Design an enzyme around this catalytic site. Sequence first.
Site, PDB file in Angstrom:
ATOM      1  N   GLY B  31       5.604   1.906  -4.209  1.00 45.30           N
ATOM      2  CA  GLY B  31       5.813   2.890  -3.135  1.00 45.30           C
ATOM      3  C   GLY B  31       4.917   2.542  -1.941  1.00 45.30           C
ATOM      4  N   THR B  32       4.998   3.313  -0.861  1.00 45.78           N
ATOM      5  CA  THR B  32       4.449   2.909   0.456  1.00 45.78           C
ATOM      6  C   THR B  32       3.176   3.733   0.754  1.00 45.78           C
ATOM      7  OG1 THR B  32       5.994   4.160   1.670  1.00 45.78           O
ATOM      8  CG2 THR B  32       6.260   1.606   1.424  1.00 45.78           C
ATOM      9  N   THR B  33       2.286   3.158   1.698  1.00 44.46           N
ATOM     10  CA  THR B  33       0.966   3.672   2.134  1.00 44.46           C
ATOM     11  C   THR B  33       1.126   5.148   2.583  1.00 44.46           C
ATOM     12  OG1 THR B  33       0.683   1.492   3.104  1.00 44.46           O
ATOM     13  CG2 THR B  33      -1.102   3.106   3.431  1.00 44.46           C
TER      14      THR B  33
END
Lengths: 53, 245, 53, 241, 245, 238, 232
Positions: B31-33
Amino acid sequence: VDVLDPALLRSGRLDRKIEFPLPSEDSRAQILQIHSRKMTTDDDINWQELARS
Amino acid sequence: IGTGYDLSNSVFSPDGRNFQVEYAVKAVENGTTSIGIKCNDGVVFAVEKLITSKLLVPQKNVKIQVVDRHIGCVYSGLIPDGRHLVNRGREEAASFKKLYKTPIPIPAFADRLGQYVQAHTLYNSVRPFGVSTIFGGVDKNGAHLYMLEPSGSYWGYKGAATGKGRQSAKAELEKLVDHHPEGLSAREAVKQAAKIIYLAHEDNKEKDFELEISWCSLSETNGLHKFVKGDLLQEAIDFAQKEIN
Amino acid sequence: EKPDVTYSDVGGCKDQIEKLREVVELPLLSPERFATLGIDPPKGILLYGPPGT
Amino acid sequence: RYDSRTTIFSPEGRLYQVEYALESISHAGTAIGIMASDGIVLAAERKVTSTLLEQDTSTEKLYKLNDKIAVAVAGLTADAEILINTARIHAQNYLKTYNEDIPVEILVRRLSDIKQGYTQHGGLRPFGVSFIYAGYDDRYGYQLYTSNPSGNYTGWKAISVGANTSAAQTLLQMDYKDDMKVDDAIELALKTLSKTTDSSALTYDRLEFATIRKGANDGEVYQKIFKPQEIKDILVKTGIT
Amino acid sequence: SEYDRGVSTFSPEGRLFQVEYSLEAIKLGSTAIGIATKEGVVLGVEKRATSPLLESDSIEKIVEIDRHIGCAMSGLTADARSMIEHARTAAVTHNLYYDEDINVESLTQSVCDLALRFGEGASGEERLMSRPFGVALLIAGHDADDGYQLFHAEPSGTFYRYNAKAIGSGSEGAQAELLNEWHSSLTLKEAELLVLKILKQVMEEKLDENNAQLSCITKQDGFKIYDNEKTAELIKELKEKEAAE
Amino acid sequence: GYDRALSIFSPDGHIFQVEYALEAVKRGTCAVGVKGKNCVVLGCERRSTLKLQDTRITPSKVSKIDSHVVLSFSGLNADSRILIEKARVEAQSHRLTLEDPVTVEYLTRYVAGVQQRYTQSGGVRPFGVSTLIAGFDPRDDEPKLYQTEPSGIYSSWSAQTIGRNSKTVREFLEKNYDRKEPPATVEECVKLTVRSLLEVVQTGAKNIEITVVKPDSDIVALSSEEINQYVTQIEQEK
Amino acid sequence: RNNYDGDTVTFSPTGRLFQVEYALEAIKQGSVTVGLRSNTHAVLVALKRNADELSSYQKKIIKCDEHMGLSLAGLAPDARVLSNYLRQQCNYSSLVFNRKLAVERAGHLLCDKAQKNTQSYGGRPYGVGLLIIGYDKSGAHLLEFQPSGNVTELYGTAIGARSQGAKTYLERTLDTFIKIDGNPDELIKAGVEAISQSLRDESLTVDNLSIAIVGKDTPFTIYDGEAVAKYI
Ligand SMILES: Nc1ncnc2c1ncn2[C@@H]1O[C@H](COP(=O)(O)OP(=O)(O)OP(=O)(O)O)[C@@H](O)[C@H]1O
């Protein structure tokens, strides 16, 4: 990794153990590209989009 | 591995742990920051939402969702799974408001969420969650930020970070404690969040991003949660652009 | 040498038989097309299957 | 193998669970019921005996389920326990409802149905217990039955279940006479029990016994358990002790 | 393989091979042919006997679902008792609710709703049937509004409208014949002899009324399952026609 | 392996449980039904094992559902037991609702319906029994003989054999029996039913069991003595 | 291994589910359809597939409501259950709140529904994508539904088999068809060109065209036959 003989599992006969994984998502797109530069390329191809598949 | 342990999620290995919950975490890595920046007069949430192609609509999909009107939440990992935990949080939040006639304390929310995740490891007709969730707000006792692991672990956080580029993100947060020992104002912690996420996009560099920032602040949003948008957001963009280059 | 077997003595005009034609006959008649595309022309084939097919 | 559950059959359509449950009965001691004209005698064998074991508080393989019908027990005893109670409760349910005691055939039919029902549906185990039902009802006078762990019943004039089933069966039928005196019924039971049993000295404490008669105390079906001191005597008449 | 041991477990093709397999149950049962015309749909079948002691005059494989909706079937009859039962209820509950004829198409959907049931639960259709249905129907009837229609209700998929359809064992060779012999110019008497003509071709039996059974849906004549004399008469005409040729 | 549940099918579309259930019938002894012009005789192989075993208290292979429907069975004895009482109640519930004597069509269709319900379900096996349900009605004079199978499929047949070595008994019955002429008299219906059973018994005239059902609620079960006159009559002609 | 492929409650070592991934394969095997929209109009154009030529086609458009509707790609049983659940929600909204529920708000409920069967032991996952359209006060919207159940708001998309050439078309003409407002003919026109490109083993006919349109002055209407005779 469990066929490695105990002769070399002793220090100072191997010291670096270096893993190669199965090419991740970002890695597939690049490999596909070089294969594709042996044959004609076109604007139609998007490797990112083939890599998802 | 096999033999339970990773085939069932209530079965324990000789290692005293469960390897499926590590795998739940691995999906968070993918998943993303997302960051949350605790402040002394608010809390700030920022998220990187990647742009797959440019057919997508601008500022119309997020991972920022609200509970009540004062608790912001953002999740990273598996997107539809992460929606449902916040949704389950709402149903819980609503019950608190019914019985006690008052908004939820952020440490009250943190306890109830962690019971829901922990339950999905007690049964085997259930799947665990595979999301972290940075959350928090402002209440009576001030501003509080918490972050929940798919592990069902939480602790208070002066900075929380998750997603892939979190290595860069954690280091920048710790610099933020050192440079300002109050953790800076919430206004400038929005700008500070934009500089973080852009550096985090050097880990995600292959595609484009959309920066969505939200806040909830004691007097800069007047104790309520709102989206950070317009000249506030345009500022963040500009500060961030300046400071990578 | 030179069998007394054609695709009358084989029943079915099967999928494999259609891909089989492409390997032997097509680059023998015209190696030009393969060269231009930038594929290296098929010449290896492995026929495999259960017995009695 | 296809022994994973009751639902699943082998190619041949047999079910292994039934088979195991038959074999369970013969890993606990011989039990013999003899019907005679003048009474039906029940006799059973103790699979347990320790020197400090007591068995004088109760018979562990004989229960009266009603005041007119009683059962001798072969199988695992925990399994036995549940069903003994189910039958006795069902017996009195009949007594409550109709103000007369349960006919034998209904009583047996009820328990084989329950036992089959565990095979027909669900996850529940079959319960391998063979009861020898000895009863009196006005339908066919004295009646001696046994129930299969396969979940059906067959009428009898003698049957043996428990250990040495083949051995007990030929020996009983060889010395069967259509009539049979209740004293001879007793005498026979003890003689077949000694041979089957690997304890050389058949003593009264290795024996459970009841005799069931309406020829004694007429107009009344009366089931009477013998006490140890009575069992002790009959062994001396048969010359064991 | 491994994808035919789960009913919620998909193949690496995205399919269910429990369901795939139920298509071969449909094919296993004996041939049924339906042919829609602008005058009515004629529904014919195949039966099989092994003994002449079989009462062939008191067995069902064309069944009445209404007095204007009829059906043929092919596949497992264990499954079919249930399938035909549901579909009777719907036609009756429609007249209960409405006092007006069910639609052919509408009936087709309701049947397929019971077909959907493979496990338990699911919203908006509480599932009570525990395995895949092993039965298909050719559904023929008449509502005014769409005239005479022929559908094949497919438990695996969903319904497909046909202008002529063969199912069962003899389906592949029939379908081709039915391409070359379905017209927009068919008459009802001609359709009747057509069905027998196609049946015989793929039937490795003897053509007789003892293993055949015609029926029509004509909205002016009601649903009429035919007599043995009547069908016998149609066997006789067929033979004089093809003798001359 | 697809013979592990009734919710898993083979690529041919079978549930082997039903197929293995049909082999289970064969374990249980034969039963034969044959209709005449004004009767049905439902006749069966009976077992005499030992002198100890009785007949009074030892189950019959015929059980009478009611006074105008009768039922024979072949399979495991325990499985048919639950099915028979179940069948009997269903038969009563007809009259409870409608207030009419039970229809034979209604009875074969519900009873195999109980079987069908179980087969449809994946978490429970159905029975391993095939039955004959034979009968008349006070309104209809047409004699009816119906069949069930372990799939929960009911079929109607003029004459049928099911049970132990049924197939061999079947072929003999085909020949003598005609749909154009079934047995005219009752006694003749019985002679054929006996001729068929002789084959399965080997010898045993106490091991042949005859029951007769005629309209207007006539069921009789024939004395031992009566069954014996047929056997001796068939040996003089033989 | 793919011994994590035996369950719906068991995540793989890399944190994937194989169940959700095989369901993506089922979209690909499903029939192609193109969504796109303008500020004032939204369209689905879908290829109507028959099983043969004695077969009179299959509807690939289900009308959800008078301001909503969806199209499909992948499983037909699966599209049917989730259409029932979605229709109930539109009725509900209209019954209890007097309101045309926003497309996007609608889409979070259908997303959950999917994830119910993902969470639970039993419950078949869903292996269909649905393209959702509607026109409320906040104008046209287009959602792309995943077999994960994720919801993606786009100006334009295509899914199904050979649908990638329609995404390359739309990208180029992206800004063109948005600016056209108050002109349904052109938007309709665009969806035909997109799905021309897809084709293989097929030619468009009258009865392969199904156009579903809702807009600024238009009810959810599905157009077929003589009314797509102006756009064949
Ligand atoms: N395609 C066919 N046309 C006609 N007959 C066929 C065909 N395929 C197989 N047969 C028959 O089967 C016989 C034996 O099998 P064949 O030699 O064709 O098979 P294969 O699978 O290539 O064998 P092996 O394992 O023996 O190498 C042939 O001689 C022929 O009669």
